[PDB]
Each structure stands twice: as structure tokens, then as C-alpha cells.
Design a protein around this ligand. Structure first.
Ligand code: HEM
Ligand code: HEM
Ligand SMILES: CNCc1cccc(OCc2ccc3ccc(N)nc3c2)c1
Ligand SMILES: CNCc1cccc(OCc2ccc3ccc(N)nc3c2)c1
Ligand SMILES: C[C@H](O)[C@H](O)[C@H]1CNc2nc(N)[nH]c(=O)c2N1
Ligand SMILES: C[C@H](O)[C@H](O)[C@H]1CNc2nc(N)[nH]c(=O)c2N1
Ligand SMILES: [Cl-]
Ligand SMILES: [Cl-]
Lengths: 361, 361
């Protein structure tokens, strides 16, 4: 266990300090760490290490098209929190600062890491801002992806209004508590964007909306053998995540048939490509709506052009590029991007963000 | 060498005869084959084996979405050919019978297999029907994918008219000849489809067309250790191959900017998703045009629904399914198909079709 930790620490510190121009400081820092492990079973990252590790982890995320901006990640160090009111307030603050009145700042808030594999803080939310979903007899309301978390919140005394867009409460558990606690999101903190279309007036009849900032809160950040299981982060949306998946997937909001109706085309024949046409108009609407409201968003073409620059930058820096082609291609017109036409090495490099088991389900 | 052949033969004959309900005939057939190899260095497939192997090979082609119809493949046995006039006439016949006045019959014509690794017939064409491509000083004409074969044909005394749609001649080489021969395609054999749009009259201004039948002629069919390096086959097109790739790719005909102009939208801003919209209209046009002319074609949604039935049929038959997710997803709206949302085992099972080195380049 100390072995695993010490090895990961050596590899991380060497790489981190080398990138920071601090290679001469490695030996002594490794000494102090070597001693810290032996005596304590673990080690504490300096603020520099933690900030740079979170950035490296984003840089190494094979499935992320948005990596060009890895080095400008805003890292908030909240390893000092000890109470659920502090965790709540840190989560609220992250929402406010990341949102930044619509000019989204990619941000991560880092909570105390696991100790003996024992979590200090365990966040139940998949994103800090997400819509509830309900499925009783016949009745399908809200986001189906949220059905199991929604049902767990309602087990704890929360009750949703059962609109298609109920905001789930924040829900997390403190070490030593048997049950999580939940806190309703202050609506003043949550920017939402009504979906309208630039040319088609009737599009507002769909009464679609989405929230401004995706803040993924259920992954584990690993840096130098330290497991930060609670470390929510956000970028800005790529439009297709909303228009081609959240609002379009049959198992999510399933809106293509309704889009086809409001844009005035038939939804009767596959050869009419009505789904494709509906997708393009819905995705135009999403980009238009976010831009009109002054909320950051990127389209999949601009995003892919940025990712090409990330590839070029990787090569120029002497770093291997890794990537997961199946996740990097956009779900709309993928062959119109350069990503589609090359292959990527899907190797896992640490620091990195990882999946971890849900505590509901 | 005999070892490799004999092993592949045992595996193929057992599987083939089992599927044909002829399991009791295996032992004796294996005996005759065992003897045939020892005495001759090779073995000759019965007509049943060859027909069933070509069908199995299609069934095992991981990258093919059209596999539902594997068992109805029309197999033409041309292992009897010895002269270049016979090969020419067999290739002409394949075009005529596969085209079938627009009601395309999936067909394969099988030529004599390699003997000592020595080819009896070597087809240079990538497809029997394809357009030439030219690239001299600044000037880009026709299909860039055809530039190297076009240049090789012109080395042999062929001359293209240098339209954007010159039909390449058939070109192949006989064992014992140093150079291939080439034969102009009779225009009466080649169905072409002018691309028009159902709603947008101006679309014909683009003067786009494509040929009716893709007849892939440069892959190797392997069956029971026998290498049929010359075995051209065809299905019908899936519309996206023409509309999303052949006519759309920057390195192919690169028509999206011109499509955007004729459909009356600006091609200035990525956030307008003009490429996506152009793709959808071009792909609607392709499907419409083939249907209007009575030439077989499938759209990517219908095709994916058929592939779902192929998956179900595989399971019901007790056969492992294999597939290459990266090639099975359509290049237009892939997340609208079930294919996108599952994974596939990309293992290689024989019989199968394989890439082989070009003899030009
Ligand atoms: C700056 C804006 C950003 C954009 C536009 C962007 C875009 C994307 C997209 C579209 C995906 C695919 C999501 C899916 O299909 O479910 C993704 C995956 C990912 N992104 Fe980014 N991203 C951004 C910033 C970030 C940041 C700041 C981090 C972390 C510090 C991050 C880490 C990841 C990770 C870990 C995944 C993979 C998640 C998984 O395996 O399920 N991204 N990104
Ligand atoms: C019946 C109509 C058929 C349709 C609609 C169809 C559809 C497709 C498509 C769209 C591809 C991908 C091509 C690309 O992206 O370049 C493909 C690949 C393939 N198909 Fe089919 N196909 C059909 C029939 C056949 C037949 C009859 C065979 C052989 C007997 C075949 C064997 C293959 C093979 C080997 C590939 C992979 C080629 C490679 O690796 O480059 N298909 N098919
Ligand atoms: C439950 N859906 C799968 C799943 C599980 C865990 C994390 C995750 O993250 C997707 C993800 C992660 C980071 C992102 C950053 C920016 C962005 N626009 N999308 C992003 C999307 C997705
Ligand atoms: C040169 N492009 C790559 C390359 C090399 C060799 C074969 C090949 O075949 C693609 C292919 C093969 C069979 C097909 C059958 C039907 C169809 N509609 N498309 C089909 C497309 C593609
Ligand atoms: C090598 C690279 O992944 C390449 O662009 C592949 C991707 N998927 C594909 N899928 C299909 N159907 N056809 C192709 O030509 C390709 N090209
Ligand atoms: C497992 C299966 O391949 C799955 O549908 C993947 C495919 N590629 C993807 N790509 C992105 N960007 N997001 C996803 O959720 C998925 N899902
Ligand atoms: Cl999302
Ligand atoms: Cl083609």
C-alpha cells in the first residue's frame, strides 16, 4: 500500500516538477514525502502540486475534446473543509464562480482526499446542476438518466415538483454520517437557457431549456497516488451534448419527433432523413440560444479545431497524445471533423479522472 | 505451408458442412482433401463450399452494416477462366447482372485463386466502376482517391477526357504477363444517377452524379486456406457513402460549400452548423435521386435497423457477433442509431475479406 503510493508519488513528482521547471527540488521533496509516508501512511500535496496535477489530469483525459485549455484550469483547494455546511458552501461557491455571469470559467473544487480508502466527503450528484426524472405507472417526467438519484433523494424527504426540469438538490455524505444530507439549490445561482431558434418562431412552443454549466461531480481525481474522490469540475458545454444527446436520445428527453413537427417536416419516412434534419435544427437552436443569453458554449467544429491545436501543442512539447476516438468524435457530422479521419492511442496516463461506484443503485 | 492449409481446411469444412446440415460428410471430404493437399499442394472447393464460404465471409465482415442479407449473396464461380478476354467478359457480366436494371443483386464473381502465392489474375481497380482523378499544377479534376490509379492507366496508353466523372477503364493483369491490360467500360453497362433534390430546384445546378453500383474489386476472399485474391463483389449503396463521404470529404469531391450556396444558406460561421445542414440536404438528395431513378439504395437508419436484425439473428443462431464500431456507425447522425449505443467485439473470424497490397503505388 505504501509501496503503491510511494511509486506513484515518485512518478508524479518527477514529472510535475520537471514541467514546472523545478527539477532540482525533486530529490529533497521526494525525501520529505518518503518520510511522510512511512510515518503517516500518506502524504499531502503542496498547493503547486495539487493545482498542476488537476491540470495534468484534464490533459490526460482521453475522452475530452476540450483539452486545449488544460493549463488555464481554475483550481480551488478546499482540503480544509470538515463540516457539511462548509462542503455545501464550497459547492455553492463553485457554481457561482464557474458560472461567472455566463462567461464560464473552467474550475475544479478539490475536497479532502480518501485516507485509508475511507472517503471524507462523498458526493451523490452526477452533476451539481441536473434535472430530476420520474417513472411511475406509464408516467415519464423529466430526465430518465436521473431516475435512480431522484428516487434516492425522495427517500430522504426531498420532493420534486414533477416538472420536466426540477433541479435536483445537492446531495452528499460526510465521513461518519450514515445518511447523506441534501440542500435545495438557490435559484439565483443557476443560470438556465430557454431554447429558441434563430429563424423558426414556433420553436419556443417546445418550451425546452437547459442549464448553463455542466459540473461533473462524481469522478475521482487521482494525482501521485492520492485519491481525491470528491473533486467536482466543469468546462462549458459543446452544443451537441445538449442538442444531440440530452434533448435527443430516446432514453433522455427524446424530442426529435416534436422538433420535426415544429420545424414543419414530416416524421414518417427514414429516407426523408427527418431525424437528421431535426438534429441539425435543434443543435442550431441550442448554440443560438446560449450565445443570445451570453452563456459560453462551443460548437463541435470549433471544438475540433481547438483539439487539433491541442494535438499540435502536444507534439511540439514532446508529449505523447492519448485519446478515445469513440468519444472524441462529435455525434453530429463526425466525418466533417479531422478527428474522424485519424486514430488515437487510448492508453491511460496518470494524473487522470476516473469513474467510481455510485452509492445509490 | 501444407500445414497451414490443412488446418484452415479442417476448420472451414467442419463449420461449413455443419451449417449446411452435412456433418456426416465431413470425415470423407476431409480425407479426400488431406490426400489432395499431399499430392498437389492445394485443394479445390466444391461449388457448395465456395458459395457458402463467400457468404460466411460477408457474414464475418466486421465493418459491414449490410450483413443481414449475407445468405442471399449471388455467387458466380469463374474459376474456369484462363484468358484476359474471359476475365474481361466475366467482369462485364458481373456489372450487368449485379446492376439488374437498377434492382441491384448483391453478387460476387470468383476467379481462380492464388496457387503458390502466385496470382492467376490481378485486378488493379478498387471498384469496377469508379471515376478518374487528376492533379497537375493547381488543377484538381475528378476523384482525388483515384489519382494514382488514373496516373497508372495513363502510363499504359489510356487517356481520360478530364471531366470530373471520367469512368476508369477495367485494368487487370494475367499471370505471365508483365503489364496489365485495360478495357474501356461500355457506357450501356453503367447506370449513373444525376443528383437532384426533392424540394430545391437549384440543386441540379451542381451537376452532381454518382454511379449506381459499388463493386469492390481489390480485396482478397479467404476460404478454408484458399486465397481468392481476385473476387469482386457488390451490394447496393448506403446513401451516406455517397452524400457524406464521396461527395463531401475535403479530400474527395469537397462539395459542401457549393451545396450550402445552392440551398441558400451562408457558409461563414461554424455556429450556424452550415456544414451539418449541407450534409443533411445533400444526403436527402442522394436518396431521393436513386429512388426516383429506380436504383437500389438504403438510408443509414433503415440499414441500422436491418443490422439490429442481423445481431438478433446471430444470437438466435448461436453465433458470436463481431463488428468494428468505428466503421459500423454512419457518418451522419450516428447517435440516432442503436449501433452508437453498444459495443462490438472486433475479433477476426474466417472466412473473410481482406486488404491486399496495390500493384501500383
Ligand atoms: C472547457 C470546456 C470543455 C469542453 C467543451 C469539454 C468537452 C467534453 C465533451 C463533449 C466530453 C464528452 C462527454 C460525453 O459524451 O458524455 C468531455 C469528456 C470529458 N471531459 Fe471535457 N470538456 C471541457 C472541459 C473539461 C474540464 C475542465 C475537465 C476536467 C478538469 C474535463 C474532463 C473531461 C473528462 C474526464 C471527460 C470524460 C468523462 C467520461 O469518461 O465519462 N473537461 N469533454
Ligand atoms: C447489400 C448492400 C450492402 C450495404 C448497404 C453495405 C454497406 C456497407 C458499408 C456502408 C460499408 C462501409 C464502407 C466504408 O465506409 O468505406 C461496408 C463495408 C464492407 N462491406 Fe458491406 N454492404 C453491403 C453488401 C456487402 C457485400 C455483398 C459484401 C461482400 C460479399 C460486403 C462486404 C463489406 C466489406 C468487406 C466491408 C469492409 C471493407 C473495408 O474494410 O474497407 N458488403 N458495407
Ligand atoms: C452518466 N453519463 C456518463 C458519465 C459518467 C461520469 C462522468 C461523465 O462526464 C462527462 C463529461 C465530463 C466533463 C465535461 C466537461 C465539459 C463538458 N462540456 N462536458 C463534460 C462531460 C459522464
Ligand atoms: C479505398 N477505400 C478503403 C477501402 C479499401 C478496400 C475496400 C473497401 O471497401 C468498402 C466497401 C466494401 C463493400 C461495400 C459493399 C456495399 C457498400 N454499399 N459499400 C461497400 C464499401 C474500402
Ligand atoms: C482510421 C480512421 O479511424 C478512419 O477515418 C475511419 C473511421 N471510420 C470509418 N467508417 C466508415 N464507415 N468508413 C471509413 O472510411 C472510416 N474511416
Ligand atoms: C459504449 C458505447 O460505445 C457508447 O454509446 C459511447 C459511444 N461514444 C460516445 N461518445 C461520447 N462523446 N459520449 C458518449 O456518451 C458515448 N457513448
Ligand atoms: Cl450533460
Ligand atoms: Cl464508394
Amino acid at each position: 500500500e505504501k509501496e503503491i503510493l510511494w511509486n506513484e508519488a515518485k512518478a508524479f513528482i518527477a514529472a510535475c516538477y520537471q514541467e514546472l521547471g523545478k527539477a532540482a527540488e525533486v530529490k529533497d521533496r521526494l525525501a520529505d514525502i518518503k518520510s511522510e509516508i512511512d510515518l503517516t501512511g500518506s502524504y499531502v500535496h503542496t498547493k503547486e502540486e495539487l493545482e498542476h496535477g488537476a491540470k495534468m489530469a484534464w490533459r490526460n483525459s482521453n475522452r475530452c475534446i476540450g483539452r486545449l485549455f488544460w493549463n488555464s484550469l481554475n483550481v480551488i483547494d478546499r482540503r480544509d473543509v470538515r463540516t457539511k455546511e462548509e462542503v455545501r458552501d464550497a459547492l455553492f461557491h463553485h457554481i457561482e464562480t464557474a458560472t461567472n455571469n455566463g462567461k464560464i470559467r473552467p474550475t475544479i473544487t478539490i475536497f479532502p482526499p480518501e485516507e485509508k480508502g475511507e472517503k471524507q466527503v462523498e458526493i451523490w450528484n452526477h452533476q451539481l446542476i441536473r434535472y430530476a426524472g420520474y417513472e411511475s405507472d406509464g408516467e415519464r417526467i423529466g430526465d430518465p438518466a436521473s431516475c435512480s438519484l431522484t428516487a434516492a433523494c425522495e427517500e430522504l424527504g426531498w420532493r420534486g415538483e414533477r416538472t420536466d426540469f426540477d433541479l435536483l438538490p445537492l446531495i452528499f455524505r460526510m465521513k461518519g454520517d450514515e445518511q447523506p444530507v441534501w440542500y435545495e439549490l438557490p435559484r439565483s445561482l443557476v443560470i438556465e437557457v430557454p431554447i429558441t431558434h434563430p429563424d423558426i418562431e414556433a420553436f419556443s412552443d417546445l418550451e425546452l431549456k437547459w442549464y448553463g454549466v455542466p459540473i461533473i461531480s462524481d469522478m475521482k481525481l487521482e494525482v501521485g497516488g492520492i485519491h481525491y474522490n470528491a473533486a467536482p469540475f466543469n468546462g462549458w458545454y459543446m452544443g451537441t451534448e445538449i442538442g444531440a444527446r440530452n434533448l435527443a436520445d430516446e432514453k433522455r428527453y427524446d424530442k426529435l419527433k416534436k422538433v420535426a413537427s415544429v420545424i414543419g417536416i414530416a416524421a414518417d419516412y427514414n429516407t426523408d432523413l427527418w431525424k437528421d434534419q431535426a438534429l441539425v435544427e435543434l443543435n442550431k437552436a441550442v448554440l443560438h440560444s446560449y450565445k443570445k443569453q451570453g452563456v459560453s458554449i462551443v460548437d463541435h467544429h470549433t471544438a475540433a479545431s481547438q483539439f487539433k491545436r491541442f494535438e499540435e501543442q502536444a507534439e511540439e512539447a514532446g508529449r505523447k497524445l492519448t485519446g478515445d476516438w469513440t468519444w472524441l468524435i462529435p455525434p453530429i457530422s463526425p466525418a466533417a471533423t479531422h478527428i474522424f479521419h485519424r486514430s488515437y492511442d487510448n492508453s491511460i496516463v496518470k494524473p487522470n479522472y476516473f469513474y467510481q461506484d455510485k452509492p445509490y443503485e
